[PDB]
């Protein structure tokens, strides 16, 4: 568009604290949601993904999404 | 090219009115300070997905994180 904030990114590394907090791999994670391996590691990577794909695995995990994203300095 | 196993929820951006009116900001100002486009926010009046680059230019503005913002409820 034409934002005119632009200085922070995301964050997934809660995700990852939270699988780490209940014994959860991330394999068992992807296969469980159904996530492709191309939008998985754009979660490693803390870039973009779809909504869509943010609450499939809020759903499965019955969290929220502040349990799983942070909006931090870029 | 997205097969998801789970599609029972949706997103909502109702906590971004409470933060506006807790601090009594109308949704006008918030889309001209922010730059959001008028469909793009009118997306926000619906419930509608949006880019995470949109939402963070909103924390960014107000100071706050995505869980101030949004949240996934049942469909």
């Known amino acids: 568009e034409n934002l005119y904030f632009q200085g922070m990114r995301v964050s997934y590394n809660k995700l990852w604290?939270?699988?780490?907090?209940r014994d959860m791999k991330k394999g068992e994670?992807?296969?469980a949601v159904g996530?492709?391996?191309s939008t998985f590691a754009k979660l490693g990577?803390?870039?973009?993904?779809?909504?869509?794909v943010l609450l499939a695995?809020?759903?499965y995990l019955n969290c929220d999404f502040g349990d799983i994203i942070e909006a931090l300095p870029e």
């Open 57 to 59: 695995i809020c759903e």
């Open 17 to 21: 604290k939270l699988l780490i907090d």
């Open 29 to 31: 994670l992807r296969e």
């Open 45 to 52: 990577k803390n870039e973009n993904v779809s909504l869509t």
């Open 35 to 37: 996530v492709s391996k």
